[PDB]
Amino acid sequence: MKTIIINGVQFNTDEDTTILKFARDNNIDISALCFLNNCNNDINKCEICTVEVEGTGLVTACDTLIEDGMIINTNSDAVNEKIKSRISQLLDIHEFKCGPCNRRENCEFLKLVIKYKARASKPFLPKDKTEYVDERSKSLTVDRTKCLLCGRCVNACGKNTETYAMKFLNKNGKTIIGAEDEKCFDDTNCLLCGQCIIACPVAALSEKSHMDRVKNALNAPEKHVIVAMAPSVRASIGELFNMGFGVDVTGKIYTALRQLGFDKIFDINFGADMTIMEEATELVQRIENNGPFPMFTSCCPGWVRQAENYYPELLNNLSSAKSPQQIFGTASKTYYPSISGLDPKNVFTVTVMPCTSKKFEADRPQMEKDGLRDIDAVITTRELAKMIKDAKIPFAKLEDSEADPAMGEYSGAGAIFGATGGVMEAALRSAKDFAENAELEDIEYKQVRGLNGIKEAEVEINNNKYNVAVINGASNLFKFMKSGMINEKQYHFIEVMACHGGCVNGGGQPHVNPKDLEKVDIKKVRASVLYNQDEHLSKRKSHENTALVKMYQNYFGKPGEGRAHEILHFKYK
Ligand code: SF4
Ligand code: SF4
Ligand code: SF4
Ligand code: SF4
Ligand code: FES
Ligand SMILES: [Cl-]
Ligand SMILES: [Mg+2]
Ligand SMILES: [Mg+2]
């Protein structure tokens, strides 16, 4: 056993763990900054977690294991002096102007500055702020006037994606973070998934803003602005209005969007049902033609970029169905004018996404037809929250309203898209009915749900057995391929999400304090909202969506054929 003294208190423990973890488990406060995801910044450690160990001196609690005999002090003057000094030195390289800053209300660094009453020795007031900012990407932006060089984004990129597309760089003799060779992220192997943003404790990493695109369209007299939110938004955005975690705020969102001036309130879950119509039809076709196998989902643009950059030989195996965002957008410029009288050129289609990579997808040159973009702007969950707050809309006290039904109705299958395994489960519900020409009652595929990184199942479709896999996070895609797991059997249908947990954990989602992440499983609680909707919806299959059925009957025809196949599909070359 080990006997540990912390701040005069004796502990007897068998645990093999760090001082930081042991202290935290025993209600002893130790600050941290560069420690996250069970890693710290191994070179140029932040030292905010400093403690004193008798007989050794000052040590970093976050990467020092407890040893029998240690006597530790976490709150001596020497300790607080050192921590304050490191915060002061960070302020010397930080444009400390919180007023207009997009992390003003939830900044980890600000909290530490306040906790230790630190001040800069010489305030940093960049003039060529141009020099510190990189806005070239369609999805990410960097503001180095805020960057603490804490490495959390580099560590998060490595762990979440294994691309190491975010790097430390030596730029004219100063250390920065950025992409390979200081290129635009979009021109590197980066997936544009934004996990580096989620990991950042300050406003040094952000999404590429579309808020001006949106406001300009809202204010243009002749534009008719459609808005449609992703599955995950309704499970998440309430966090930023102090409503807590796991709160379903669907109806409040619809009201807020009307109060912001949007002209039509639809829902990307309608697009999710459309993607299932096309993709489940495609799966049945591929079964009847014995391939090609495996078919991969094509709805996650982080995964599409991963395939493009590392597995281009798989691009032809991706489903040709457009993603819910792009398939909805295509219909918003074709079907929707046909049922409304709008001039298609005057329709401006906005989505709200938990995702930064969706901005790149929407701006792909060929995601348009007859000069009309499928999707004209994409705002993240965070961006919508800012728009609501800037307009002084009292979100938490809004009454519930409904979407406009024509492209707004959704089934429970579409509702679960935002969780890892949701697309797989939704697609199987329709594919099995399609293949067996039946209306089956057992529709729940629990085996593909949850947070395991690589999940598989055998499913029986029309009296034959098929193998499916759900790949949960970009790093797990690499593991699945490089390990040869793909070779252990013939897989027929594989879901891939780049963000572990699915889109509920996407790079456009609300930041969560690392100490809130110790008390809340964010991936599970956000997903729970979506499964709950599925459980209480009357229609739980995409092909039972009444508004969608009318759309195919009256405009697109049979899925996966004819008109449907000509404009609702996309292949990467
Ligand atoms: S990143 Fe945090 S400390 Fe820095 S200016 Fe923004 S809110 Fe203030
Ligand atoms: S967007 Fe994703 S892949 Fe690109 S640097 Fe950030 S974490 Fe890495
Ligand atoms: S961008 Fe953010 S996470 Fe990355 S080193 Fe700078 S402060 Fe840390
Ligand atoms: S998992 Fe969802 S949020 Fe993450 S990159 Fe893919 S589409 Fe975007
Ligand atoms: S938090 Fe321990 S060195 Fe940064
Ligand atoms: Cl309508
Ligand atoms: Mg370390
Ligand atoms: Mg307007």
Side-chain angles (χ1 to χ4, degrees):
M1 222 84 177
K2 288 192 209 64
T3 291
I4 312 293
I5 316 294
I6 305 174
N7 297 337
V9 184
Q10 190 174 102
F11 299 87
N12 311 275
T13 187
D14 51 301
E15 274 206 71
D16 202 338
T17 189
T18 62
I19 296 169
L20 174 62
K21 290 189 184 71
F22 188 86
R24 293 248 165 108
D25 284 348
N26 287 275
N27 315 134
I28 286 157
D29 179 59
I30 295 175
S31 296
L33 177 62
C34 82
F35 180 83
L36 192 76
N37 292 142
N38 204 58
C39 273
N40 69 334
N41 205 22
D42 294 325
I43 301 311
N44 296 330
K45 286 179 209 195
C46 87
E47 299 183 343
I48 300 300
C49 65
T50 292
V51 299
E52 199 157 44
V53 170
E54 178 185 328
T56 304
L58 302 180
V59 304
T60 42
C62 78
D63 62 1
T64 300
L65 298 175
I66 60 174
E67 271 185 278
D68 177 56
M70 291 176 148
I71 293 153
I72 301 162
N73 278 286
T74 71
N75 200 40
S76 76
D77 277 8
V79 163
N80 294 316
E81 242 158 56
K82 174 63 101 64
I83 297 169
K84 190 198 199 153
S85 172
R86 298 289 290 181
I87 300 173
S88 172
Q89 293 165 29
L90 290 171
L91 284 165
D92 290 339
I93 60 170
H94 193 83
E95 191 192 45
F96 190 49
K97 302 198 190 273
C98 302
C101 183
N102 66 26
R103 293 289 303 273
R104 179 185 11 101
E105 295 172 8
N106 62 353
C107 179
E108 281 184 54
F109 186 60
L110 180 46
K111 191 279 289 153
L112 281 163
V113 174
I114 293 169
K115 176 178 177 176
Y116 291 90
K117 294 151 181 313
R119 50 193 83 160
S121 284
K122 168 78 136 213
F124 181 51
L125 316 162
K127 315 273 171 91
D128 209 348
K129 189 150 203 223
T130 307
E131 195 45 54
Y132 300 88
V133 169
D134 185 358
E135 307 184 338
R136 291 173 295 174
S137 173
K138 297 178 177 180
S139 295
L140 315 165
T141 70
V142 190
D143 181 0
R144 303 192 172 87
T145 69
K146 315 291 194 203
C147 178
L148 314 173
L149 293 174
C150 71
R152 278 163 51 162
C153 54
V154 174
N155 282 327
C157 182
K159 302 191 91 153
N160 279 99
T161 82
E162 293 287 347
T163 67
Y164 292 91
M166 181 76 67
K167 306 182 179 302
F168 288 100
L169 305 167
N170 172 18
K171 165 182 183 168
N172 303 129
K174 309 190 217 33
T175 303
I176 64 165
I177 49 74
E180 181 157 29
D181 295 320
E182 215 188 332
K183 294 160 101 201
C184 177
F185 283 89
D186 306 3
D187 298 322
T188 74
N189 291 324
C190 176
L191 314 184
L192 302 172
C193 70
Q195 289 299 319
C196 47
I197 302 166
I198 297 304
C200 183
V202 291
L205 298 173
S206 301
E207 60 271 71
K208 184 64 175 297
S209 174
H210 283 202
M211 285 178 296
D212 278 357
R213 299 194 187 185
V214 174
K215 290 181 213 158
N216 287 344
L218 288 168
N219 292 333
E222 87 286 354
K223 292 297 189 185
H224 176 92
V225 187
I226 294 166
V227 64
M229 54 157 158
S232 301
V233 180
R234 74 212 70 214
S236 314
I237 196 170
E239 300 170 19
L240 294 177
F241 295 89
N242 195 41
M243 302 177 72
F245 301 99
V247 183
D248 185 334
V249 296
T250 305
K252 289 183 170 65
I253 293 168
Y254 292 152
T255 299
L257 293 170
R258 289 199 171 87
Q259 293 195 1
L260 284 169
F262 288 99
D263 301 284
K264 209 73 171 182
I265 312 310
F266 284 148
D267 202 297
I268 290 305
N269 291 2
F270 177 94
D273 283 338
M274 298 173 61
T275 292
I276 294 310
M277 289 291 317
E278 300 297 318
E279 185 165 9
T281 294
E282 184 178 9
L283 179 58
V284 176
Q285 288 168 342
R286 281 193 200 196
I287 288 182
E288 281 165 19
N289 301 340
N290 270 23
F293 295 129
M295 179 165 90
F296 296 86
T297 57
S298 62
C299 46
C300 168
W303 148 240
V304 173
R305 280 188 61 94
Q306 190 179 27
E308 287 177 312
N309 295 331
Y310 295 92
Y311 297 98
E313 66 272 18
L314 301 181
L315 290 176
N316 186 71
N317 293 78
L318 306 191
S319 168
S320 61
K322 280 180 171 187
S323 73
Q325 167 168 286
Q326 301 300 136
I327 212 166
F328 178 97
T330 304
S332 83
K333 306 303 180 76
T334 54
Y335 171 63
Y336 178 58
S338 87
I339 62 163
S340 68
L342 287 159
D343 189 328
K345 71 143 172 113
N346 294 328
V347 180
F348 193 99
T349 302
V350 179
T351 69
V352 187
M353 289 286 138
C355 182
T356 48
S357 202
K358 285 281 167 197
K359 299 167 180 278
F360 187 87
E361 184 182 10
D363 283 348
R364 284 193 182 251
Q366 294 180 102
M367 285 292 177
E368 68 168 53
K369 197 54 55 203
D370 295 328
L372 306 184
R373 311 291 305 158
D374 303 348
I375 295 296
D376 301 286
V378 178
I379 47 174
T380 65
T381 303
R382 295 183 299 255
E383 283 178 283
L384 178 59
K386 180 179 162 54
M387 299 198 24
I388 292 168
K389 291 175 178 179
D390 283 355
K392 303 174 253 93
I393 291 172
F395 182 84
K397 274 326 263 182
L398 291 177
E399 283 227 86
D400 281 358
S401 70
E402 262 161 344
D404 298 307
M407 299 187 60
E409 179 185 346
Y410 60 88
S411 83
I416 59 174
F417 260 51
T420 169
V423 176
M424 177 58 68
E425 175 161 6
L428 292 170
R429 289 183 190 175
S430 286
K432 198 174 146 73
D433 271 14
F434 292 177
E436 297 178 1
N437 183 255
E439 292 137 29
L440 296 154
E441 317 212 5
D442 185 6
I443 58 169
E444 294 187 349
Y445 293 81
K446 294 199 190 223
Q447 273 177 90
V448 304
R449 309 180 179 185
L451 295 181
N452 277 330
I454 304 178
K455 299 166 280 179
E456 70 158 345
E458 171 182 272
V459 301
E460 193 209 290
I461 296 156
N462 208 27
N463 312 305
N464 283 49
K465 295 293 185 299
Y466 297 93
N467 297 307
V468 306
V470 175
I471 305 302
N472 176 26
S475 61
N476 285 307
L477 188 283
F478 281 131
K479 178 178 188 177
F480 183 73
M481 302 294 290
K482 295 167 91 213
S483 67
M485 286 174 228
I486 182 76
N487 308 319
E488 291 186 64
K489 53 169 67 99
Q490 184 62 70
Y491 284 97
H492 302 101
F493 184 39
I494 300 177
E495 170 190 322
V496 187
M497 303 281 136
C499 300
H500 183 259
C503 295
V504 287
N505 188 41
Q509 288 286 69
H511 289 91
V512 187
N513 157 247
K515 289 158 271 163
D516 273 335
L517 295 171
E518 82 186 10
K519 288 270 199 293
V520 175
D521 187 337
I522 200 74
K523 295 165 191 168
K524 288 214 91 63
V525 177
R526 285 178 181 165
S528 71
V529 170
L530 309 182
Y531 287 108
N532 190 68
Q533 287 200 350
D534 173 45
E535 284 166 41
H536 301 88
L537 274 155
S538 162
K539 295 142 244 203
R540 298 181 71 189
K541 301 170 176 184
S542 299
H543 57 283
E544 295 181 326
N545 184 328
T546 63
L548 171 148
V549 168
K550 289 175 181 146
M551 180 184 63
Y552 275 91
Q553 283 177 344
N554 297 328
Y555 191 80
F556 282 118
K558 316 103 190 83
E561 310 191 43
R563 178 178 267 175
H565 189 87
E566 182 45 39
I567 65 140
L568 298 185
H569 291 229
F570 191 99
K571 287 298 268 183
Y572 298 92
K573 294 291 171 59

